[PDB]
Symmetry: C2
Subunit: 417 residues, 2 copies
């Protein structure tokens, strides 16, 4: 029963990360003590996804070093694919049902000879690798601990059966990233269906703000968002639970009570749910991928009832540690006696807020534009609710300069209570 294991195995060291020296063989037991498999710690299994060349991709010799820097004295097993993945795509879409059985036989061998606990096994998966890890685990003697899927495959695995894809019953805790879900239903590269216990949509999941290397740009963010979560142990990147992509832009759903607002990546909290769990956050185009989240509610008031549209504002943020000066945002359908809310983000740490400017800029540039007296409003209060630290401050002004007018000097608000 141990000659149909052509999908090989390997074990890599922190001193040698880019090679495949010490192999493991299912059935031969003189090699397990040859690769120095430490029987006390956890075990990472990294399953390779699709490829078109003969070698590995470029993210595996970085993910090996990241795992060996975050969790020292552990086990990272690299599964091999290079006689089965270099094909066309419906050809390699059928080999997952065999490679998952090979991995299941290997794990049952390790759990039935050496009495391995199967309680400290992470199953990392790329686009085909996530479905490989999903078809594994269901064919084990008991439940595996955690399967992490990084932007799984879309085309032939959507509309399929639950024992055929990465289903939420495959393990005890499954988290799935959804970086590249742009396209029609059934014709997308990533999968559009929520499949895990926790389902994170970074930037909504349509694309990523960085787009042959440029061709696969927003398909490698599901690895570069995980390497960053392994490196930044002390600083987690929270993700926020909402109900739709359009509602998160209005900022009505920054609520972190009753099993909401989980983390993203390795430091996620094991929380089970009853249904699909869509979660949201925003990112940045560089190697620190953390941004903060602020909610701003603005009360408009005045006398002259005049509606407008597509007005551009500029706001500042003045706090204890540092400051943010020229954040732009727009609001359509501004009018009197309303209460508007939106979402605001930044990449500079603030601390606790002190003051806040508010400028309503002018689209016109001509020397004509100083006349034809500009529209204005009477702003009383701004409610600000921070994202992580749940503080709800109140801002107001004095009984002077409380009149925002387009193309004029901005108002300045202070801490009001």
């Amino acid at each position: 029963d141990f000659r149909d294991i052509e999908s090989k195995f390997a074990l890599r060291t922190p001193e040698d990360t880019a090679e495949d020296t010490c192999h493991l063989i299912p059935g031969v037991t003189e090699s397990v003590a040859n690769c120095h498999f430490n029987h006390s710690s956890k075990t990472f299994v990294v399953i390779h996804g699709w490829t078109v060349t003969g070698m590995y991709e470029s993210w595996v010799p970085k993910l090996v070093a990241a795992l060996y820097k975050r969790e020292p004295d552990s086990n990272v097993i690299v599964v091999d694919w290079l006689s089965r993945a270099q094909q066309h795509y419906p050809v390699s879409a059928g080999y997952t049902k065999l490679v998952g059985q090979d991995v299941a036989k290997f794990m049952n061998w390790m759990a039935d000879e050496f009495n391995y606990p199967l309680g400290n096994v992470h199953l990392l998966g790329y686009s085909l690798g996530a479905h490989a890890a999903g078809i594994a685990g269901s064919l084990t003697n008991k439940k595996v601990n955690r399967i992490t899927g990084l932007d799984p495959a879309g085309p032939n695995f959507e509309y399929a059966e639950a024992p055929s894809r990465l289903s939420p019953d495959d393990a005890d805790f499954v988290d799935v990233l959804h970086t590249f879900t742009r396209g029609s239903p059934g014709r997308s590269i990533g999968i559009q269906k929520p499949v895990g216990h926790v389902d994170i949509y970074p930037n909504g999941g349509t694309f990523q703000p960085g787009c042959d290397q440029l061709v696969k740009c927003s398909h490698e963010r599901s690895v570069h968002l995980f390497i960053d979560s392994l490196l930044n142990e002390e600083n987690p990147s929270k993700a926020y639970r909402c109900n739709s992509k359009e509602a998160f832009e209005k900022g009505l759903c920054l609520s972190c009570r009753k099993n909401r607002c989980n983390n993203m990546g390795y430091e996620i909290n094991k929380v089970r749910a009853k249904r699909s769990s869509k979660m949201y956050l925003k990112t940045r185009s560089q190697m620190p991928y953390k941004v903060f989240h602020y909610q701003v509610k603005i009360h408009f008031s005045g006398t002259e009832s005049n509606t407008y549209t597509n007005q551009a504002f500029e706001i500042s943020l003045y706090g204890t540690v540092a400051e943010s000066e020229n954040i732009p945002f727009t609001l359509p359908e501004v009018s009197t006696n309303k209460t508007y809310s939106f979402l605001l983000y930044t990449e500079v740490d603030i601390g606790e807020l002190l003051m806040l400017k508010l400028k309503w800029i002018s689209d016109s540039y001509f020397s004509w534009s100083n006349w034809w007296s500009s529209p204005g409003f009477d702003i009383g209060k701004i409610r600000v609710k921070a994202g992580e630290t749940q503080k709800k401050v109140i801002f107001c002004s004095r009984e002077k300069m409380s009149y925002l007018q387009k193309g004029k000097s901005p108002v300045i608000f202070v801490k009001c209570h």
Copy 2:
């Protein structure tokens, strides 16, 4: 919790059996992978008993080689005593309640860090070592598999409590030898009480037929009967269940049905019982310790009613492979119209019996003794029941020479049916 472990530990190799090079340390985990503890096989723990010098005894560097010859690629852990055993005897009779707790802490550490099964652990014990292994096991997280006690301690551990000695609830299967149980109740070197699931009394347990080296002669037979059982894999030495020492000499209890007639030593069958289980066998004074067991029933018949006593007989055994010629036995209270039975043993393999002489010798030697016509009887049949191979043959003679007479020619019996 890992600095009160002054009773050290060691692991020995088949290439180095008489030294203590690679130690194990409870708590320090860089040494478990240093001694190459194979996590797949079984584990032997040899607990040393009492001593009076500073070094080990002479049977441990033979038992190590015997275990490594019988079960290759296994684990033999030698427990150390040499700062606690070189004392007086009521001094070393109190340290077992500490060494057993140290061994229990070591086994719980191995079973709670490396997830060891605790299903393949043999606990070998000498005279104090058996009670050390008995006070261990009760203080483990679950039941250990098998504890073997080799002639446990007698004086201060008799009349004690069940959580204080080697009790039958200490493990899942416990076998105990009783080689040196001679003495008064409460004043014996070995223990006189049956304590195990299987309790074997070789030669009844009073002494052994081989009796400073000569002082401890019949206390080392409980190790030399186990080394022989490890070496002779293909040839087991059966032990026979009876009810008293006097009844086994009459041979009325050679019955091997309904969970009777188990083996002796390593090759014993796991059979649980409801009460104490006394079992019997005989041995020989040299390194092959196997003898066969034959039951002989003799029907006396005649006319002249004359009782006698203390008459000596000589019998022969003629079989397929070899022959036994001059086996002596005696029978008191011989008389007409009776049926007598006894036990007979030998050390030469026979096979299947063919013929059997029977000679009733004369105590007198004088030239007078040919006269005063000797007493005689008329022997019809002899029922022979072999020990291992349950065959019940019937022997008889022809209708000539059927008259055994003292100091005359012997009768010769053949296979009768």
